[PDB]
């Protein structure tokens, strides 16, 4: 329901804040749904404290939302996101690359295939370089070429890799006229430094507000169907304070306050990319037993034969006159327990 | 009409309506960075 939506959004913002500490005053770009979806998939095969740590780290209180409801919710989420919508490209899916000597439970496999948009591939991790290339090429394909080289290094004793991918391509409800785009306009990257960017320009009715508490401008730009972009522009010197305030509660407040009116709007045309090594971050956030020799993934294989070793994410974004294209992928690596 | 000029650091969210999911989240500090 929308209990889950509040929780997933708050996870996104808490992880965002961790990144503002890890990579201070740098571009940040990630898909929270990709990260959340991958971890919940892993949790399907987990038991006891290994399982509860994962879903509690994702933000869930097991009293409010029992393990089975969380499982149900995420299965329904993936289904809904993939349901075909005219004028919107949105796909989110998973791939499990399972070592050819592992003994996966039929129940774990049939479930993820049927209920969680998962393709399963028997993989020869005795050729680690070839396996790395196969997985990278699969992710590249599923992201329409946009996420290249997800996995830079794969441990020599890897026996399973779980990947989630997301690809999004949409047109603005009100596209920009490229004849009104300025080739080179200043964009302030710090107090005394500008870079030059193409600056798109149109005057249109947009939902917008000035948040009087948080001292920021909020501008909504709709895609033609089922999606929107929100731009949050803090007053000079106020980015840190706005970052501290971002939460599901803040989004709910803005949803009420946004009003449609004429705006003379200037938006840059640009692309960025980001990568995250998430292993240590997820450990710090509370996923501990998954990495340990007493990891409990008894729902995944007959012999409970694996443990988590590494995690990483890559995401890319392009914004231009026609719309937006964005993609991301999440990687979880397992080794013998 | 009011002017909104996105010419300094900003946060960005891409949201899907029917599920209220945040698909992507970021901060753009330098839009020209490799
Ligand atoms: O005010 C409208 N907001 C839109 C856009 C929007 C803003 C935000 I902030 C979102 O993030 C968000 C919101 C909430 I509440 C939570 O809990 C979380 I976590 C994250 C999102 I996702 C979307 C909106 O769709 O909510 C608005 C503008 C225009 C129109 C509507 C709403 C709507 O019909 C419109 O033409 C509409 C359309 C699609 C919907 O799924 C829902 C609604 O709500 C609604 C309700 C009423 O009474 C009249 C019109 C509309
Ligand atoms: Ca797609
Ligand atoms: Ca193998
Ligand atoms: Ca079996
Ligand atoms: Ca293949
Ligand atoms: Ca300037
Ligand atoms: Ca017009
Ligand atoms: Ca066992």
């Amino acid at each position: 329901l929308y209990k889950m939506s509040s929780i997933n959004a708050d996870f996104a913002f808490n992880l965002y804040r961790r990144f503002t500490v890890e990579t201070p005053d740098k571009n940040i770009f990630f898909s929270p749904v990709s990260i959340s979806a991958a971890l919940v998939m892993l949790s399907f095969g987990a038991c006891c404290s290994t399982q509860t740590e994962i879903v509690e780290t994702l933000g869930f209180n097991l009293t409010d939302t029992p393990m089975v409801e969380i499982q149900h919710g995420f299965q329904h989420l993936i289904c809904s996101l993939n349901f075909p919508k005219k004028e919107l490209e949105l796909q989110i899916g998973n791939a499990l690359f399972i070592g050819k000597h592992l003994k996966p439970l039929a129940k774990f496999l049939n479930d993820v295939k049927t209920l969680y948009e998962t393709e399963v591939f028997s993989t020869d991790f005795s050729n680690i370089s070839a396996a790395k290339q196969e997985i990278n090429s699969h992710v590249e394909m599923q992201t329409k070429g946009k996420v290249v080289g997800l996995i830079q290094d794969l441990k020599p004793n890897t026996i399973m890799v779980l990947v989630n991918y997301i690809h999004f391509k949409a047109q603005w409800a009100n596209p920009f006229d490229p004849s009104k785009t300025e080739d080179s306009s200043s964009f302030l990257i710090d107090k005394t430094t500008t870079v030059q960017v193409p600056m798109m320009h149109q005057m249109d009715q947009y939902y917008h507000l000035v948040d009087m508490e948080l001292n920021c401008t909020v501008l909504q730009m709709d895609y033609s169907k089922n999606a929107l972009a929100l731009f949050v522009l803090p007053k000079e010197g106020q980015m840190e304070s706005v970052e501290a305030a971002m939460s599901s509660k803040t989004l709910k407040k803005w949803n009420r306050l946004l009003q449609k009116g004429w705006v003379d709007l200037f938006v840059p045309k640009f692309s960025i990319s980001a990568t995250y090594d998430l292993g240590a971050t997820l450990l710090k956030m509370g996923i501990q037993h998954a990495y340990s020799e007493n990891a409990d993934f008894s729902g995944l294989t007959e012999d409970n034969g694996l443990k988590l070793s590494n995690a990483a994410h890559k995401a890319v974004l392009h914004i231009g006159e026609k719309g937006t294209e964005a993609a991301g992928a999440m990687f979880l690596e397992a080794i013998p327990r | 009409h009011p002017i909104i000029q996105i010419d300094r650091s900003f946060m960005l969210l891409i949201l899907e309506r029917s599920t209220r999911s945040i698909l992507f989240l970021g901060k753009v500090v330098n839009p020209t960075e490799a």
Side-chain angles (χ1 to χ4, degrees), chain A residues 146-159:
Chain A
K146 302 305 183 195
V147 181
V148 179
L150 174 63
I151 303 170
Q152 286 301 299
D153 298 285
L154 201 56
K155 283 188 79 192
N157 54 337
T158 299
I159 58 171

Side-chain angles (χ1 to χ4, degrees), chain B residues 17-31:
Chain B
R17 277 204 171 78
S18 74
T19 67
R20 297 166 171 73
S21 293
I22 302 175
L23 302 182
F24 299 93
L25 175 58
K27 174 172 57 175
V28 178
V29 174
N30 182 354

Side-chain angles (χ1 to χ4, degrees), chain A residues 44-318:
Chain A
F44 295 161
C47 303
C48 302
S49 63
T50 301
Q51 191 184 51
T52 63
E53 284 169 19
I54 294 166
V55 303
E56 289 177 348
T57 296
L58 292 176
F60 296 92
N61 184 307
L62 287 161
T63 308
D64 296 337
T65 62
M67 189 64 72
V68 166
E69 181 183 341
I70 300 172
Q71 292 173 345
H72 268 299
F74 270 89
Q75 289 160 10
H76 184 46
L77 176 57
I78 291 299
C79 187
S80 178
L81 293 175
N82 284 314
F83 193 81
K85 332 186 195 168
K86 291 165 179 60
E87 300 184 28
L88 172 58
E89 289 171 42
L90 177 54
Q91 288 298 120
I92 177 165
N94 302 288
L96 190 66
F97 294 84
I98 181 72
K100 65 192 293 191
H101 305 293
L102 294 198
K103 294 175 277 185
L105 296 180
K107 215 194 90 168
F108 180 76
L109 298 183
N110 189 241
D111 283 19
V112 298
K113 287 181 186 173
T114 58
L115 308 172
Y116 214 64
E117 201 61 50
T118 301
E119 296 197 289
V120 177
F121 302 105
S122 186
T123 303
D124 190 351
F125 288 111
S126 79
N127 196 332
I128 194 63
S129 180
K132 184 168 66 175
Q133 184 189 339
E134 176 188 348
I135 298 165
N136 281 341
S137 293
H138 183 72
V139 170
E140 183 170 349
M141 176 184 177
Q142 299 294 72
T143 60
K144 310 300 179 185
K146 302 305 183 195
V147 181
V148 179
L150 174 63
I151 303 170
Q152 286 301 299
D153 298 285
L154 201 56
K155 283 188 79 192
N157 54 337
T158 299
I159 58 171
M160 191 181 80
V161 173
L162 185 160
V163 294
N164 174 273
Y165 59 86
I166 179 170
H167 173 261
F168 171 85
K169 192 178 182 183
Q171 295 69 57
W172 299 120
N174 268 305
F176 293 84
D177 183 355
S179 74
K180 293 192 174 75
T181 299
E182 293 289 344
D183 289 333
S184 179
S185 192
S186 297
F187 185 102
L188 198 63
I189 69 169
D190 66 38
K191 291 196 182 82
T192 66
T193 314
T194 62
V195 298
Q196 297 298 298
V197 298
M199 190 68 73
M200 311 186 293
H201 178 210
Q202 81 175 285
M203 206 292 287
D204 213 287
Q205 291 185 4
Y206 290 108
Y207 283 99
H208 69 284
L209 61 76
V210 177
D211 184 314
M212 299 160 179
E213 177 178 0
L214 300 181
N215 205 11
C216 61
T217 294
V218 180
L219 185 269
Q220 174 182 321
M221 285 207 308
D222 286 344
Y223 296 106
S224 52
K225 292 295 183 184
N226 191 214
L228 65 91
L230 287 184
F231 294 78
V232 181
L233 185 67
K235 171 78 190 305
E236 264 290 337
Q238 298 299 314
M239 178 60 81
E240 195 174 12
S241 57
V242 173
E243 294 173 318
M246 294 304 296
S247 66
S248 65
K249 182 180 174 80
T250 297
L251 295 184
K252 287 174 184 171
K253 176 190 172 181
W254 292 345
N255 181 68
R256 294 176 66 84
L257 291 177
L258 283 160
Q259 193 184 359
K260 194 174 202 178
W262 301 106
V263 175
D264 194 10
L265 177 65
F266 298 80
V267 176
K269 176 170 181 180
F270 70 102
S271 308
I272 56 162
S273 173
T275 59
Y276 301 93
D277 181 343
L278 292 170
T281 297
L282 293 171
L283 178 56
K284 285 183 76 184
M285 286 177 80
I287 295 171
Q288 294 167 11
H289 275 88
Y291 291 106
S292 76
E293 291 182 354
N294 279 327
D296 191 341
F297 291 102
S298 296
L300 215 162
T301 64
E302 288 182 9
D303 57 344
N304 189 28
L306 61 77
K307 63 188 181 187
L308 187 64
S309 52
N310 279 304
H313 182 64
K314 179 170 186 175
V316 301
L317 173 67
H318 174 74

